[PDB]
Structures are given as structure tokens and as C-alpha cells.
């Protein structure tokens, strides 16, 4: 979800 980078 958010931040987008913090999810695979």
C-alpha cells in the first residue's frame, strides 16, 4: 500500500 516501496 503506502509507501508503495515498503510492500513487495
Amino acid at each position: 500500500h503506502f509507501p508503495q516501496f515498503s510492500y513487495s
Partner: antibody, heavy 119, light 114 residues
Framework: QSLEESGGRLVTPGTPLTLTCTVSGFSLNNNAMTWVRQAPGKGLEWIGLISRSGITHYANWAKGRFTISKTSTTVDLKITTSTTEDTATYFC????????????????WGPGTLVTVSL | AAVLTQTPSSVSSAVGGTVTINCQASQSLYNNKNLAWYQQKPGQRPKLLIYSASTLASGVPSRFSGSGSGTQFTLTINGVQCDDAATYYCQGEFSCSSADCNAFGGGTEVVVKG
């Protein structure tokens, strides 16, 4: 507040390379980082990034040959197998987002380190 | 995939002229407006000029501005100076789930005529 890349050198095609970005003035626990390269006379090209909690994201072109890892003060880029087309200056940069918004940009850059993949 | 088509590839402007550079995204950007612009003096690292399409970054003169949303974005230099001779790049953020998270435009070399 400053970044410094190291590890650039002459590389024989087909062999591995590790670059390092040493961070001064903030912790990577709180700051995402990215690698970008630029072949001589060519444009900037995004390689990949690592989030604060260690999630990695790569450009499709790079997946499976480039690996990013980090400590709280350093971020590395490993090239599995190098080829001539990897000849470039490699930059590390801070990725500008926090827990409230993502500004989208890379707002702190190192000077770059030069990689030469060549016989 | 996701790309930014940056035009022109090169341009020459007299001192005091105006230069606008265009970036067209092949799909909508993350947050609709997460397009940044960088200046790169020859042999030097990139420097952020504009982010979020229109926000002037730290240490950037007021003659630089940006505009756009969705897929069409521009950078304008209003009253070009000799120091503005450089290569400029746009950079878009995309949804990582559907494309590469980021991409750059191909650059624009700006020559300033003194």
C-alpha cells in the same frame, strides 16, 4: 546529507562486481535509497531501490542480475555477471518519501563511481 | 512497461530566451503528478530542479518552473543564462505493481547562445 560511491574499476566481461554507497548524516533505517547509472555519452537509467524496511524493487531489465543490500550506513549494488553494456557511472541517491507522502524524486546524489566492463 | 518520451533531444537558445522541454508518460504517474526534473552539468552528478511536477527544489533559481499532470509534463527555463547549458532529464514514478517503479526520459541537451 552526503553520499559517496566506491568500487568502480575495470571489470572483465562475465565477472561479478560489487559497488558500495557510504552514507553520511542520516540512517538508512529512515531513508530509502536507489541506484541509477549512466553509460558514457548516454542518459540516466534507473536500476533499483531499497526501502527503509529492506524491500527491494528492480527495473525489469535489471531483475536477476543486480542485487541491492544495505546496512544502516551503506548500500551495496552487486552485478552477478557483467557485460560491456554495463559500462557506466553508477550513482546512489536518496528516495524522497516519508510516512505521510511520497514526493517521487531522488533528492540527494553521490558523485558517482565509474565502472568499465572491457577486455 | 512504462516510459517517458522526452522532447526535444537537443535545443539551442539565445541568452534571455525561453526553453520548454516536454515529457510524455506512456501511462499515468504515481499520485498523478510525481514527475521530477534534473539538471546535469557535463561530468557532474544530476541535481534535482523540480518535483511533484511543479515544486521548485532547494537551491534552484526562480527562472525554472514545471507544469503538468497525468501524462504530459513540461519544464520551462524563463530567461536562459549561460550557466543553464546542461542536459536535463525528467523522471517519473509509476505504480511498482504494474510497471517499473521509476524511469527517466532520454534527456535534452540545452546549448545556450552567447
Amino acid at each position: 546529507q552526503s553520499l559517496e560511491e566506491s568500487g568502480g574499476r575495470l571489470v572483465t566481461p562475465g565477472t561479478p562486481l560489487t559497488l558500495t554507497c557510504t552514507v553520511s548524516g542520516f540512517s538508512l533505517n529512515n531513508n530509502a535509497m536507489t541506484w541509477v547509472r549512466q553509460a558514457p555519452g548516454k542518459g540516466l537509467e534507473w536500476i533499483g531501490l531499497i526501502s527503509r524496511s529492506g524491500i527491494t524493487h528492480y527495473a525489469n531489465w535489471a531483475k536477476g542480475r543486480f542485487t541491492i543490500s544495505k546496512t544502516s550506513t551503506t548500500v551495496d549494488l552487486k552485478i552477478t555477471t557483467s557485460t560491456t553494456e554495463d559500462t557506466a557511472t553508477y550513482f546512489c541517491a536518496r528516495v524522497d518519501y516519508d510516512d505521510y507522502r511520497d514526493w517521487g524524486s531522488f533528492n540527494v546524489w553521490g558523485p558517482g563511481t565509474l565502472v568499465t566492463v572491457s577486455l | 512497461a512504462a516510459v517517458l518520451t522526452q522532447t526535444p533531444s537537443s535545443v539551442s537558445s539565445a541568452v534571455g530566451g525561453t526553453v520548454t522541454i516536454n515529457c510524455q508518460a506512456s501511462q499515468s504517474l504515481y499520485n498523478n503528478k510525481n514527475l521530477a526534473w534534473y539538471q546535469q552539468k557535463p561530468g557532474q552528478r544530476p541535481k534535482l530542479l523540480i518535483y511533484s511536477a511543479s515544486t521548485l527544489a532547494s537551491g534552484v533559481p526562480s527562472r525554472f518552473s514545471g507544469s503538468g499532470s497525468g501524462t504530459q509534463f513540461t519544464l520551462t527555463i524563463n530567461g536562459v543564462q549561460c550557466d543553464d547549458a546542461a542536459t536535463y532529464y525528467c523522471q517519473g514514478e509509476f505504480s511498482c505493481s504494474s510497471a517499473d517503479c521509476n524511469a527517466f526520459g532520454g534527456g535534452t541537451e540545452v546549448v545556450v547562445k552567447g
